[PDB]
Design a protein around this ligand. Structure first.
Ligand code: ICS
Ligand code: CLF
Ligand code: CLF
Ligand SMILES: [Ca+2]
Ligand SMILES: [Ca+2]
Lengths: 477, 522, 522, 477
């Protein structure tokens, strides 16, 4: 479609809204101009969702508990408030880890204070203190506790910080109060930020005066990879083949001790900018640790990233860098040879959270595919800033897309494939459009790294070219 | 590395030696992990009677619950009405979760909106959110009815639903005649099933409270059926099927069967089928109202008896032989239609299957959980099969219900070694299947983690999971099953006896060790 | 010894140390057993490509067949007619076996007589056995019809069935008008399905051959349905249900659905339901005749075309999506009835399930076996699912059939690595699942011994069995399932994907070893 | 039910038959007189079945291949003829064994020559020789081959004896021709006799001049126990606890070497008299080995049997006998204490093969139950001789009972329980009468010995007293 055709599509779709919603939503939809460096000229983001329009967004508790804290494997995370939030979010996100669950690791478990009305009327601080004792009794190998606030906590005036300080002193235990109540902010994003500050204030400085850690010039941390289907592991392997030492992973398969050791590293390697730029900046300001953004989706981006990271170190790491690239060249070349001809020219629309809608475009292009529309649930304008250069001219951009909008866009544009979330999947399959979950990887993955690229390719092919898509229309009509 | 012709996903990729060595170095270098001997010792301890006592002394901590929160049930109730949009007044995070939860169980779209109350609304209340939300929703998704519930934020701040909707109409955000039934649905009271009860009662009241004066009980010659919180398509279908084969006039009030099973034929249908407004308005004219899951339909019952003047029959859920019999006989009494030859034969076919499979079912011990009506029906059918339902867990059960289940247990010798637990969770149940090990668990997908735990003690301590209940996330299309009626009992019987035989085949598959008992014929 | 409170059956009783020690002494003292290292050596050898080459050179030895003999099929055909007693002229041993075989698959009574030919009949022939046998049968069990087939003794010695029945009537042992259709059914030609074809054609001939002159094609406005050898109740039922839903008039010729599923209500019913004599007599008046399993109904077809003058359509077995579509479209064409909205919806629901589950099914490799029509239908559906039916075994298949399946395979990329084997048995197949290991087997209960064998090589070599076909002896009530139509495809799909996910859960159940991939959600 | 009443029942049931069948069947039905010595006074047996009356009998092939040879574990048994017989009898009988199936043991496999029409027309001997070569190639650890003749073999004039001799010498292997064609005899019984003679002629004397086996005074063989559900193992354990050495088991879990070593024993212990009295008598005549009948069903009979067997040896075995009996006494007393109160007074009808219709009566009486009707498919009058003393007065006796008879008898007598076979089971369950399979033990067992008695009691109780039996009539009628 021409630029003009996309603009006309946008206005047409906007016609159903009451005037207030129409004028809001117009500011959140745009036609890409790849020359634009500064996105604020063409799109607005990180604003409140319009009531009644079926945003795909979650809440700050989703951002703090679900995203940032939850994967930390040797801590216990308390979903503090009534029973709903912890239940729907129990083991919904595939943030993989190695451990003995219920004994020294607790990620897929659901700990909750299960607020009843009495807790609402009288406050939950006494229940929380008692809960923490019960946690210590029944789970002695836990290495710290977080308190993930749900909506009612701040609304009823509980003082979980006091509880955390007092029980923390009594038990000599790291207990982290997190104010990630669902009413705060406008999406998962503020949950990221609150969570980052909670790590900063309650965890990160504990070894500030400890000098027992044996450091090396090649110490790094992986910041903002939550190890979806093993993504972080298939990244780590490459960094260490290149000669680096990965002291920490934030927070997929992450332990509290590696978090605590992270201020000892020489460089912070940031994959998810959106969710952990806050703590990366803090670590630059307080410890003088530089941070850099990278991208391990597909061979083009992975190779570029490895080279860029290696340039931050000496000749030995650069040499190792080229050895890694040479090692994997035949492997990803084989994947491309097998799958690019089967995917060449196919058109994809994406809608995801705060990183992947731009970060995976390169992998798709490595299979000769074209991303014709993309958008984010909760990105900020610095994200869209990074997005417009990664997208083609005339492509469609959408911030906090409504269900109605997304469906109409898909109807007009007719992608060969859509990559989005569980709430979108079955909608578009019924339309006869191949769908891949680009949050959960549809229970497949890893997609990061070279080993991830092979699985990514296999998955896009298996679904786009599946026989089922030829069968939706009955031969008798 | 990957072999391009046989690509490995996470399993078994990370079992490659270079990955294993990498992971060992991560652990050894930076995780400051408890020694494996300590981990073993603590695991072993968590399997003991001592731990179980500490476990059951919990007063404040809940671990791995077997319940959800009210508005989930309000949403499912609302989906059961024609061209109806579930609308949850409150914070949007909740609605993302509600939708995803049901998405994963049904593998279907689940439409629901929020009015996105934020920090601004936290002290001023959500009146403006309601006005804009109802207008936006009606304009954008074109429902013919919007059924409103609440998140815990709106409840805590005390938003008056009625006032907010009334003012929404008064100021022109939606037409005065447009149907907006509502119910207060607090996270922190009861569970998801309570939410179903509240929403249904709200909808019934909306369509009948103000027009009772031209109503005459029995004047439309049908029986109303209220299914309650129901996540098996087969249960809506089987009830409609049996009533139709009997020639009984009926109205199923809240019927999400179509909208939870739309065809993939090239279009997305946001709405499909459902109970009509006509049906709700006309419901007081029925002969009577039958409640399929009475233990979470108490408020609904209070309204149907008090306002509609229906003499709601005292029926258990129609699960198993006796209670399906009783449901059918009561329906016959109310309608005046006799039980047809077809259902009599179906009943006999169920009894026949029982006679065929009783030797493998006899004395088998089960731990089980779920919602109260489902749980008690499962218990009753297990007793009918000559099984022992030893650990009966209902996290959202109450003391009256527990008295009812205990009376059911007492009425059978197969109930001797059974205990009913209310307010207890799956961490409690984990202890029970270690300390008083059953042959199987009957439960939802969260049970898989208990099975893992038990196998970790040893293969001889493993308690396999049998998936019946909600949510089932890790198998495909089990939501199509039936658990009600003779058909439901046939499916459950088959599932149970064949789980037994699968496990026995596994235990006897060992060449020259145990396969003396690997019989071709069982 | 026994503990009275927990009595041990053979498993695990004989694992007690005193039994173990006893068995060790028996072996060492008196069995002159090959040393375990030699047994290990030979087993290992039997899993090799060299062994497979020797295996596939067999010309005289058959090991673990995947077929039975003709009169088995005759008895099942005969059971499908109203008040009809299957009667097998020949030696009684056969009839004890036919009955037990079906008893164990259906878990139901199976009625059938012999006329018990012994050494005397071996030399004088069985004429007297037919006279006395027919009279005794008619008097004792009061059938309205006796359907006569043969055991191989009767075939070898050359008993003329027609002459013998004629003489029985001529000499007054049974009334002249009493219907006694017959068919010669030799053990040593074809297989059980052939016996079905022969019996059916015999009954058709008996009732129509001599009455053709008043017959007018299409005059009764029905379509005849010939199911062939069918051992799933759901398959009779689903064809009847779909035809009824279309408003298509039909006659299912040989219908044992009732007699293979009587209720346990205090009485034994020797006969129930079935095709009436009038339906067979009136059959030439139908619009046409459709053969559900054409590859074993060739004799029937030649008679239907040659004598009834019906233009039998060229239809595959209605299994999977394409062939159910084609079946429904042809039935529509013949009947003039449109395909109704309900069936279009059902189709779309099958397609929804295929889109839902395609990522777990894609590229999965299967070994499978069974009768020709069942097998080719299963193969077709697997190709539709993006699965690879790599080893396709049909012991009683022929080269024409194989050519048709090879063509089906060639028409899909998922058939590239597939080979069809005819005349080969389950020992051949055993070799194939060792040398070219698939992900699963789809087959009957005899497959359990192959799964056992593969596990013995190692867990990583184990090929789990998925039970679809006949016979199924070691699970209960699977004979109630459906494999035809959209309903059958939904059932097969669910079974396959959930077998896949069951095995993945097993492989990822290892605490801290493989359980990183033990996902709650799949 | 008084004598005249049972006799009247018999005449009533017989009224449905044509005259020839009536006159025949009248001789095969009787009212028991426990005083009677010669059952030929009162009942006829081992005669032809009446055509068309639905006998429950099998054939000589069933008696030879299914029963006697089939269980011998390290031999390969060829079902020689068309494909049916071997397939219906594959793994139908639970003759349990220890071995590595397909490698050194072969019991649940189906080896066959799969006769096609050309084999019928030209004969199958060349096919049989080629088949034996292929068996040798593909199953090198087999320790011998048997050839189980199906109906056509003798009818077409094949000479499997010559083939067995020629191939036997060529391979230096025992190859045993068995003429158990189904047209021979009247039932399974003649198959027994044929199989016994084949063992005699082709196997039993191989070690006649071999004196290397070390013998002891306490060597016995268990003759006629086919180890159904492990029956022979739970018998063997008792014999050896008593101080005996069980040199051989015929044929449950039996090996060819055990068979060949059996002429070295001091005593043959005969359980199934019907199927192996022939070879027992042969062994007395040829080797001077005495044989005795015994009964291991229930504690009374097992104890009586142990005492009687021990009395054939010296005081040391008689002492050990009393020690075994004292050891197991509290176990079976506990069984009785648990289940007899639930089974006391209940009435049973039996219909089985050639042994169990008399042999399990004591076991029923140990649980206070009464056998009110019994009968055999294929017993001879010496079995009935042994039967009339074990049954109460005026109880009903039936030989080669017809389907019709068994149903009408049951309707009039109304037993609380029936014990018979798979062709009977579902018939009587539908009538509301608890049924236990007394061939296959309904996939349970063992039932022999003390350990077997516990399982027997458990099974009779679980079935007779199951809740399902209270539910066959709809409450609306
Ligand atoms: S051999 Fe005989 S029919 Fe004695 S042919 Fe039969 S495993 Fe029966 S009453 Mo099946 S003379 Fe054995 C028998 Fe008894 S197969 Fe078993 S139970 S004790
Ligand atoms: S935004 Fe929780 S699901 Fe809600 S009604 Fe309260 S229990 Fe239930 Fe976010 S923190 Fe949670 S998920 Fe919502 S409530 Fe707020
Ligand atoms: S009485 Fe006995 S079981 Fe019968 S045939 Fe004869 S030996 Fe055998 Fe065999 S193949 Fe089929 S089942 Fe028969 S008709 Fe021939
Ligand atoms: Ca779906
Ligand atoms: Ca049955």
């Amino acid at each position: 479609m021409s630029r003009e055709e996309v603009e006309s599509l946008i206005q047409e779709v906007l016609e159903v809204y009451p005037e207030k919603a129409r004028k809001d939503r117009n500011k959140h939809l745009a036609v890409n101009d790849p020359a634009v460096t500064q996105s604020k000229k063409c799109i607005i983001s990180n604003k409140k969702s319009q009531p009644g329009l079926m945003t795909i967004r979650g809440c700050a508790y989703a951002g703090s508990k679900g995203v940032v804290w939850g994967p930390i494997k040797d801590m216990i995370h308390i979903s503090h408030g009534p029973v709903g939030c912890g239940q729907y979010s129990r083991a919904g996100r595939r943030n993989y880890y190695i451990g003995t669950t219920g004994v020294n690791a607790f990620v897929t478990m659901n700990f909750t204070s299960d607020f009843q009305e009495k807790d609402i009327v009288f406050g939950g601080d006494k229940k929380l203190a008692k809960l923490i004792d019960e946690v210590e009794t029944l789970f002695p190998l836990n290495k710290g506790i977080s308190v993930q606030s749900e909506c009612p906590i701040g609304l009823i005036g509980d003082d979980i910080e006091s509880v955390s300080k007092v029980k923390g002193a009594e038990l000599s235990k790291t207990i982290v109060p997190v104010r990630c109540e669902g009413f705060r902010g406008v999406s998962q994003s503020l949950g990221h930020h609150i969570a980052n500050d909670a790590v900063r204030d309650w965890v990160l400085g504990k070894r500030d005066e400890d000098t027992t850690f044996a450091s090396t010039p090649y110490d790094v941390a992986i910041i903002g990879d939550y190890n979806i289907g093993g993504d972080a592991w298939s990244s780590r392997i490459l960094l260490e083949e290149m000669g680096l030492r990965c002291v920490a992973q934030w927070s997929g398969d992450g332990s509290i001790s590696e978090i605590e050791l992270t201020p000892k590293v020489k460089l912070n390697l940031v994959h998810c900018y959106r969710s952990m730029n806050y703590i990366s900046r803090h670590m630059e300001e307080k410890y003088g640790i530089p941070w850099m953004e990278y991208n391990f989706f597909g061979p083009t981006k992975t190779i570029e990233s490895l080279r860029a990271i290696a340039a931050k170190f000496d000749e030995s790491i650069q040499k190792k860098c080229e050895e890694v690239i040479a090692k994997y060249k035949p492997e990803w070349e084989a994947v491309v040879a097998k799958y690019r001809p089967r995917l060449e020219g196919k058109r994809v629309m994406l809608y995801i959270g705060g990183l992947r809608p731009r970060h995976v475009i390169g992998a798709y292009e490595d299979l000769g595919m074209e991303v014709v529309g993309t958008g984010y649930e909760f990105a900020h304008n610095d994200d869209y800033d990074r997005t417009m250069k990664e997208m083609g001219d005339s492509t469609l951009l959408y911030d906090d897309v409504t269900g109605y909008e997304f469906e109409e866009f898909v109807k007009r544009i007719k992608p060969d494939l859509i990559g989005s979330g569980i709430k979108e999947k079955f909608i578009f399959q019924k339309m006869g459009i191949p769908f891949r979950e680009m949050h959960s990887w549809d229970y497949s993955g890893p997609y990061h790294g070279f080993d991830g690229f092979a699985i990514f390719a296999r998955d896009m092919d298996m679904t786009l070219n599946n026989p089922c898509w030829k069968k939706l229309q009955a031969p008798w009509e | 590395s990957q072999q391009v012709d046989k690509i490995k996903a996470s399993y078994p990729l990370f079992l490659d030696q270079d990955y294993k060595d990498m992971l060992a170095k991560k652990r050894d270098g930076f995780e400051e992990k408890y020694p494996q001997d300590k981990i073993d010792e603590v695991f072993q301890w968590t399997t003991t009677k001592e731990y179980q006592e500490l476990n059951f002394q919990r007063e404040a901590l809940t671990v791995n619950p077997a319940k959800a929160c009210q508005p989930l049930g309000a949403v499912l109730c609302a989906l059961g009405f024609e061209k109806t949009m579930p609308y949850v007044h409150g914070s949007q995070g909740c609605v993302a979760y509600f939708r995803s939860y049901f998405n994963r169980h049904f593998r279907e779209p689940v439409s629901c909106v929020s009015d996105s109350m934020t920090e601004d609304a936290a002290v001023f209340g959500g009146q403006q959110n309601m006005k804009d939300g109802l207008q936006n929703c009606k304009a954008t998704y074109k429902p013919d009815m919007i059924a409103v519930s609440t998140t815990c934020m709106a409840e805590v701040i005390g938003d008056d639903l009625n006032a907010f909707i009334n003012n929404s109409k008064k100021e022109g955000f939606i037409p005065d005649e447009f149907p907006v039934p509502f119910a207060h649905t607090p996270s922190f009271v009861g569970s998801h099933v309570t939410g179903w009860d509240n929403m249904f009662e709200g909808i019934a009241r909306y369509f009948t409270l103000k027009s009772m004066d031209d109503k005459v009980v029995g004047s439309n010659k049908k029986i109303n059926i209220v299914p309650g919180f129901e996540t098996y398509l087969g249960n809506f279908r089987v009830i409609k099927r049996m009533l139709s084969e009997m020639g009984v006039g009926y109205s199923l009030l809240s019927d999400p069967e179509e909208v939870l099973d739309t065809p993939a034929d090239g279009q997305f249908r946001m709405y499909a089928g459902g109970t009509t407004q006509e049906e709700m308005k006309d419901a007081p004219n029925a002969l009577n109202t039958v409640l399929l899951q009475p233990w979470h339909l108490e408020k609904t019952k209070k309204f149907v008896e008090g306002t509609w003047k229906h003499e709601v029959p005292k029926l258990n859920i129609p699960m198993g032989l006796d209670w399906t019999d009783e449901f059918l006989m009561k329906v016959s009494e109310i309608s005046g239609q006799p039980i047809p030859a077809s259902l009599t034969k179906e009943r006999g076919r169920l009894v026949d299957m029982m006679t065929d499979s009783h030797t493998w079912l006899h004395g088998k011990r089960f731990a089980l959980w779920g919602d109260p009506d489902f749980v008690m029906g499962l218990v009753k059918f297990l007793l009918e099969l000559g099984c022992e339902p030893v650990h009966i867990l209902c996290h959202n059960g109450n003391e009256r219900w527990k008295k009812a289940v205990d009376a059911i247990l007492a009425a059978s010798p197969y109930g001797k070694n059974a205990t009913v637990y209310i307010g207890k969770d799956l961490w409690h149940l984990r202890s029970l299947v270690f300390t008083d090990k059953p042959d199987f668990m009957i439960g939802n997908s969260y049970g898989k983690f208990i099975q893992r735990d038990t196998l970790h003690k040893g293969k001889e301590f493993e308690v396999p999971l049998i998936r019946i209940g909600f949510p089932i996330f890790d198998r495909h299309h089990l939501h199509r099953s039936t658990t009600l009626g003779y058909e439901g009992a046939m499916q459950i019987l088959t599932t149970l006896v064949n789980s037994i035989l699968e496990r026995l085949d596994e235990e006897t598959r060992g060449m020259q060790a145990t396969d003396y008992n690997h019989d071709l014929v069982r």
